[model samples]
Target chain A: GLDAQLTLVDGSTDDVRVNLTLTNTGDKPIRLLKWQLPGSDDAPLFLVERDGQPVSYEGALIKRAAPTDKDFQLLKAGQSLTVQAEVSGLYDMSAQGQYSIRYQESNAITLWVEGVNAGSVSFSGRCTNTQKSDLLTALDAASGISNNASSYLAVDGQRYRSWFGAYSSARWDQAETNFSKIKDAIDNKPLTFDCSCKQSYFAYVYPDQPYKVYLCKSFWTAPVTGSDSRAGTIVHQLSHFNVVAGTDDLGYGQANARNLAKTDPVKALNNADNHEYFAENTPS
Target chain B: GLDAQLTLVDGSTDDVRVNLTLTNTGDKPIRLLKWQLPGSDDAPLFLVERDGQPVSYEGALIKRAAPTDKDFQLLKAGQSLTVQAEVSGLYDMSAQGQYSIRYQESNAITLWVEGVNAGSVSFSGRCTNTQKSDLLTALDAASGISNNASSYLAVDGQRYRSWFGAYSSARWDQAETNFSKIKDAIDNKPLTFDCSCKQSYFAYVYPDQPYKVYLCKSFWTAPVTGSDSRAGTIVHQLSHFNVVAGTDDLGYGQANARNLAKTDPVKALNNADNHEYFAENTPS
Candidate 1:
């Protein structure tokens, strides 16, 4: 097995520069390929101070090219190759916190770079998001959905929800109006999202004392997102960004329809379905 | 592409028996495996009077195995395979209206038993739970969580909620009391349950209407399901069942936490996260 480690040099928030030192910990002349150098496309190899946690990192998401194998950088006996990349470039470390950085290790992937078996390795580092003036400058440079904005949308829950309102379709009027206000609630706070067949809702640490609202991916659809239907969603979730709450459909059928043999209960029986989707974009 | 059709014969409030006519219209002897007979177990090939709208059927559902592929039944040259089973055995069709039933038709899943390709086919029929005296007898024969009982729990949304009280954990004494009352709501109605990463909620046609609340699979964890922690879940859903409203450590690190990170939070941050998994068993 090979060995790799990450060290945070400039442990600042925005520009979290880290060094990846890959060593031929294995007996053979392990070829540490330059193929890994351009590995700018994925979550970097950052570790969470681990005895046995994991070496993992989320990379530049949404849109980025994969790192192709080429010009191998070889690491021989007692030798190692170190590469550098801004950790923030891969992770949306815009939020200030004592965050864990990781680069997962595994013996499963054996790379024949310049033709030498280079097995698995691991690495990680600890970083801070505060006092990063350069990042502050960068954030100011592109205010809209620019560089950081793109990464923000990819991982930042609040920004993603706000973006969906506009992304679903061209917008303006109140939908965008409420969306902007929703973004204001984000105020650069850390927010994460989860969704699938969706059972969407938001939760907080305490009542109104505040922090983050989770959004379901299903709520924002192409035509659905742009409507004023989800306005209440933005506002309802507003207090939760600093708030809490918890929260499906079936077509109306005759028997399930209270013997009405109904044709889509505009307002009928057993409509115990989640009202969120129905109220999704209803302008708050 | 083969054509499959489901037909209803003795359709009633409880048992809706149907003949599954699978015609190998594609000039071949179709092999209808007996394993496909019991179809091991699943929503039987019920129909919704197909032809645009599918003729889907709901069989009595409580517990059964998958229709395993057993001895193959052969149908040759323009032939079809039809089998019979208690429709109530598979679907919880004790509702007061017409329902939808469908077996997915896929392009790739062509059967070799018939040898040639079976194109497509469709069929359906009207059904009623009212004039079905035999169903009433069957209902009486096995009343509580048995024949009707099983079907009842499977479909009735209320029982599904109460089930969580016990399923989530060893619930409180009062919690069990309420759960028993909840079961009373399901006394006669047939209920069908489907869950998985839950879209948790309850639906009904009218006030104090019939029983059976649809529940999402996600909400029931072994310990969580059996606990009164879900009391809020039962009480809140009671409104749909004709009663009224009522209402976890569940957290979302950023959103989805069923915890203090400890276990199901009957009370916690924002508190919205517990609606479905609510303090259903909580003696409050």
Candidate 2:
């Protein structure tokens, strides 16, 4: 499991230090190989235009861990590696802004690890902007995750537990409600769209202007297996960008695809595209 | 002086509102004349940009003050008028953004007001961003005024009054030191000089970078006869850009100015060029 923490340092100028720890909890050793952190992703975890050109990770000032021979090599089971990165004082995690830290993982055997069980990784950081908590809360609520829980969790009870917990049912319901309310509020507002294709991929609309949706197919990837266990997971990730216009209280939209285990259980076992297709085709 | 307070409703999917109070604290009754608050002087007040194009305030969904026959008229002496404008909930004040509230004072009377005095007449809703407070504090400190005393003033005298009292001189000195330290920290960092102008209009090579000193005209303008004592107040307003980039201590450059002020007052004052001259010489 991979975990990271970003802390705010109070000094003459504002700054944040991101400390990342990658651990191989599994019996087999894991090789990080080539990986990109949030700010390092293809288009940039957080991008800004400079000289009419887009620059990624425009805020990060120092690299705690770079994909170098000494750093981005390999990690042994039960062994942990740490890296640090610093952002100028100006980056505020609390304020309303889009940012994500992403990293890729591979096993030492050159075999592509599959499924959430293949050693999950998570990123977390603190921002000077107090509003970050609210935004994170909003994101968590929309993701059908526990508001009190950290952004990144361990698969085991020790850390990386199930991404979806018992309360995920209620959480997803609330998230659906939140999404509907947001759509209703922005029905008449303006709209703007943006798209970036790089390391991660996704699309999203501004809350104020639900009419516009920005899509990126460079950073985010669908679950490895289209299993019933992964049904709602992909849909949950997609909903972060599927904000619609008007009012409609949709139930987790499709997060309950896991609950489909009781009804049309076959739908849950479908591939990622099938789940996404269902979500896209379903009326909110 | 006439004052009006407007409570802005949150229009974004997020529940964030801006409560603004616009006041005409002058002696003469001034109508809501044409003025621009935070935008460039050439730009109209309230008109914001979208997709690289200028749009009317209406397009931005910014509600205008009702054109009341009575309220729109001249503001009376010592009678402060207030008007509040809100930024939609989706608008992130902590980011690199700009907003302005303009008013046309009665042109019936020929009066010149300094920017500093204009700031006294302007008030903002409480923002959760600490950078906002820091920037405001830095500006107020530079102006030899106590922002904490003014903004955080309570009905009880204890709230607004500083415990430092006469010791403010020492506190100011320390603040000056902190300001200088910040400049030194960034001195070696990337800086973009304005080739368009000879005056020092350098931007810290960071997006949404926090506080940059804007050179304005003179510190104080001659008092307008028969008007108000604030008429001659310095017009240079230290505009803070990104709230996320707020400063905690005075940068080292500022502390140097403080020291120079003690040793060579004239040189220090010259070094702190008047706002007009600074603006004229510096490139935006």
Number of the top candidate by TM-score?
Answer: 1
What shift in Å separates residue B112 of candidate 2 from its native position after superposition? 41
Candidate 1 chain B minimal-lDDT segment of 10 residues: B108-117
B179 in model 2: Cα distance from truth in Å? Answer: 18
Stretches of candidate 1 off by over 4 Å are: A1-3, A7-21, A25-96, A100-248, A251-284, B1-284
TM-score of every candidate relative to the true structure: 0.23, 0.21
lDDT of 1 by residue, A122-226 (tens): 111212232233223222322221223223333413222322222332322323333343344344444322121132221111122233232333223312232
What overall lDDT, based on C-alpha atoms, would model 2 receive against the true structure? 0.29
Q: What DockQ values do the models have?
A: 0.02, 0.02
lDDT (C-alpha, whole model) for all candidates: 0.33, 0.29
Cα misplacement distance, residue B96 of candidate 2 (Å): 30
Error of 1 at A160 (Å): 30
**Which candidate has the highest lDDT of all?**
1
